[PDB]
Amino acid sequence: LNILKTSNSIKLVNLLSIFISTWLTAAGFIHLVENSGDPWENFQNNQALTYWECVYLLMVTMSTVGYGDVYAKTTLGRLFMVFFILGGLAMFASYVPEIIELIGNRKKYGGSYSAVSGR
Amino acid sequence: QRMWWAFLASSMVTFWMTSVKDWAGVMISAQTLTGRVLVVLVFALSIGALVIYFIDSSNPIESCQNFYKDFTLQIDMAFNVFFLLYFGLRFIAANDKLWFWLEVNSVVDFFTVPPVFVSVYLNRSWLGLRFLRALRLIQFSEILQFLNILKTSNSIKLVNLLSIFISTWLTAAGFIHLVENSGDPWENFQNNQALTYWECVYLLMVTMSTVGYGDVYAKTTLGRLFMVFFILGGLAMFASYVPEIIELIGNRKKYGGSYSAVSGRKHIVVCGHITLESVSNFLKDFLHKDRDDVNVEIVFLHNISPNLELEALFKRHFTQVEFYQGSVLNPHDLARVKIESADACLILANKYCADPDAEDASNIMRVISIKNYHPKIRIITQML
Amino acid sequence: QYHNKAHLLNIPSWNWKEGDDAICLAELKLGFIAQSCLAQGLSTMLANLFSMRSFIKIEEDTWQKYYLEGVSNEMYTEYLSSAFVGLSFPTVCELCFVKLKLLMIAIEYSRIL
Amino acid sequence: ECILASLNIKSMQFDTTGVNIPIITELVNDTNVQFLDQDDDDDPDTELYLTQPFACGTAFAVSVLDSLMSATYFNDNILTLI
Amino acid sequence: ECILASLNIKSMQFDTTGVNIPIITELVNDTNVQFLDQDDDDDPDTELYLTQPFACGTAFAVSVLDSLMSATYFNDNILTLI
């Protein structure tokens, strides 16, 4: 749909779009399943967690930091968070990001020249 | 109470000749189907013995022998008898006696079944210590090969490494759960923490994945004194083991497999030197819109794996092109690509080679191989 | 190569009489081809007398069964009985064939005849 | 070049066709045998010594000479006889 | 080539063998000294100045002469004696 062509556009299309899509879909699923409550335990330990804290908790789970401010208080949620840990640090650590380190940096002096008159 | 000496004395302190022996128990020779199903039986039996897992741990604590249970303990009693007869056959086939008492399988068996013997001779069975039995499970690659599910050399090492990773992780979690439910003996377990088998597994996961949430911790002193060494060692093993799994994730044979024929629509075969500019020049003149009849399937063929942007070219040209891997001089490969109903078979020849005659002899070689396989298809080849 | 067998022979502790034998690939290959120029098929016939193959039966009455019965044969060296001294080489040849289906091709005389 | 020359010799005609000249060809890749003859059951899995060209004697290779090491180890005079 | 020449002159046969023929040689790799003689306990651990070839004087090397600078910094021997 007529976006400026530099191939940085296609790079961001093939990296940041999929990364963002996966991040927010994981956040939404974890929000729904955590607020759903325990299925076979009569829904007792349904925590009052919303999207903002879910996103922050997912980012803390990702990378390496170990903040214990918020965590999964249910067995199913904890095990599935282990599954996201495996899936993330496999796929989005050894399939996608090598392209992002292969991009490196942009052009160094790729400007132009404007002929200032009189010289 | 806390009669751990009975298990310690039975295991730690204790540290018609061939009518049935070579007839049935063939491990090294692996001759008879009796021995084959015997190894199958011990594998499935170890799996079933370990199936108790957290639903066993979540149920009430260890007590005296009951009468009615969810699962009958007598099946596990027969399992122990089965393992004991295995230990007897290994003892009569021990060869070197000292190496027999040294070997890991014998020592782990002598660790695991004498607790069940204690349960046999006294109705005071202990639920713990009977979950770290993944050493038998570490090798199902032999089962997979015997069942011919997987036979390639690029998957056997991968499944071995995955198996031993999973087994070591599970047994570490089991020993940690034992430590948690144990407590300090010199403190008479007055500092013990109460946790089911579930949480220890995810604690091991968050230690391995260097996250460490910290919602629950290693309160026990000797537990913490073991996690220090575990963090020292398991991370080193993990970092040593990635370098011979990264390529097996990567070197996996892509664009393989056979072809599925679709009736009523023809297809041509293109083999030879294929590179981005050449396939572009072929595609942009074969699939041009003004030529109405384009309803043929342009299957490709080459030996080396495709790379660069050819994969993306085929991706955007989804319904019109395919690809396969394998040389054209192999009749099995030619049968796989299914040229037996091919309308024609084009060939692309290199025109930038330093020696023109070698490539042209190669093209002649392709033609004679193809015509030898199927003697009536139509070939349109290049020359230099 | 055949221009290095001399270099190998020049080694002080090399005794080809004892049994230290060096196989020259070019010599044997080109000898096989050249002798096949005299009689066609001798190359493959000689090449099939060393591959230690067992007998395989084919019931299709094609040439496979005959050629496989051919390749099933091999060759060995063995001392012979003492009853054959004053007799002649053709005599022991025909006697051995007609009695136990064994045929000789050479004897040690030092020298091989 | 060897397969091309063999094909040319076997195909070129005379004043009598060209299938009666005898040719012995040296080969280095055993899988290339199937191109030397046209009426045979081609199979890359089949070993050399069961193939029609090798049986006819119109082919040869250096790969079949590995057996001579074991043969001459077991029998001392075999190499001298050969 | 040098090692082969030495072995050949030792292995020459006369009507009386070549193993008693006086000969010295020249070598550039001091680890190659062991092949020169066979009635010896050829061991790679021993230094060059101790092996049987040098001990008998039937070998030499340029690398031995690298101690000349150290032995001449303290004296005047190279000026006259050598």
Residue numbers in the entry:
A (entry chain D): 224 to 342
B (entry chain A): 19 to 33, 93 to 461
C (entry chain C): 462 to 570, 577 to 580
D (entry chain C), E (entry chain B): 819 to 833, 871 to 937
What do the study authors state?
To isolate Slo1-containing vesicles from the total cell membrane fraction, cells were first disrupted by sonication into small unilamellar vesicles (SUVs), likely exhibiting both inside-out and outside-out orientations. We then removed nucleic acids using anion exchange chromatography and enriched Slo1-containing vesicles using a resin conjugated to a GFP nanobody. Note that this enrichment captures only vesicles containing Slo1 with an inside-out orientation. We determined the cryoelectron microscopy (cryo-EM) structure of the Slo1 channel in vesicles from the total cell membrane preparation at a resolution of 3.8 Å. The structure exhibited two-fold symmetry, contrasting the four-fold symmetric structures that we previously determined with detergent-solubilized Slo1 in both Ca2+-free and Ca2+-bound conformations. The two-fold symmetric organization is most evident within the cytoplasmic gating ring and is most easily appreciated when viewing the Slo1 channel along its central axis from the intracellular side. At its most intracellular extent, the intersubunit distance for two pairs of diagonally associated protomers differs by more than 10 Å. However, at the level of the inner membrane leaflet, the channel becomes more four-fold symmetric, and near the center of the membrane and selectivity filter, the channel follows four-fold symmetry. Because of the breakdown of four-fold symmetry on the intracellular side of the channel, if the two-fold symmetric channel is superposed onto its four-fold symmetric counterpart by aligning their selectivity filters, one pair of diagonally associated cytoplasmic domains is rotated and resides closer to the membrane than the other. As a point separate from the main aim of the present paper, the symmetry result indicates that while Slo1 adopts predominantly four-fold symmetric structures in the absence or in the presence of high levels of Ca2+ (closed and open, respectively), intermediate levels of Ca2+ favor breakdown of this symmetry.
